[PDB]
Amino acid sequence: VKNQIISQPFPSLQLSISLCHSSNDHLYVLEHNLHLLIREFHKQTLSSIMMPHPASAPFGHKRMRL
Amino acid sequence: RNQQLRTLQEECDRKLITLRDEISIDLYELEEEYYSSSS
């Protein structure tokens, strides 16, 4: 809607994710995992897996080379 | 700065893991007692 996402994963269930901006029932686990998920999503770009140890080898992920 | 923060993170995670194991053993004892209660 504006700052609130509402989902219905199970039919009797309603999940709500809201960004509370103070501008001066809550589950902590999902908030903490949200921070870690976006942190892993950042670190995927800046990973050392993209580095090619063979100097001639161009670039990109390691298993995609394999 | 990076090395100091990594050491603090590792100390916190070791404390949490040992806490989880001790709490798990207590939970096993409490589960046996509660489920085997006659009532």
Binding site: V29 | I23, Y34, S39
Partner: protein, 122 residues
């Protein structure tokens, strides 16, 4: 009293057979200092078993001292302050069990949260 003596007498016969099984396992493993340790374990097991036999004869005599109703008259075919004591202790450990359930649920939830949060850090 006597209706717990019957329970103890059943438990003695249940212990005697288990103890003879443990004795036969000790005699199975004995390979001709640990020689002497197995000797001590064997002699101690045999001592406890003789104690169990004496206790069993005691319990037999006590229950056989203390029947006007023959059995098969006791089965139902188709066609007072101690009760209040029972109700008191029943209500007591009803409350105790519900509090124990709350403690157990909070421990479960803390363990699940710890494992989820630590699983996502990698």
């Amino acid at each position: 009293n006597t209706a717990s003596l019957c329970r103890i007498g059943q438990e003695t016969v249940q212990d005697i057979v288990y103890r003879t099984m443990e004795i036969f396992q000790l005699l199975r493993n004995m390979q001709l200092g640990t020689y002497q340790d197995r000797l001590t374990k064997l002699q101690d097991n045999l001592r406890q078993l003789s104690v169990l036999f004496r206790k069993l004869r005691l319990v037999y005599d006590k229950c056989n001292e203390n029947d006007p109703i023959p059995v098969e008259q006791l089965i139902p075919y188709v066609e007072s302050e101690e009760r209040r004591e029972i109700a008191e202790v029943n209500k007591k450990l009803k409350q105790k069990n519900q509090q124990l359930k709350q403690i157990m649920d909070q421990l479960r939830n803390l363990i699940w949260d710890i494992n989820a949060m630590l699983a996502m850090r990698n």
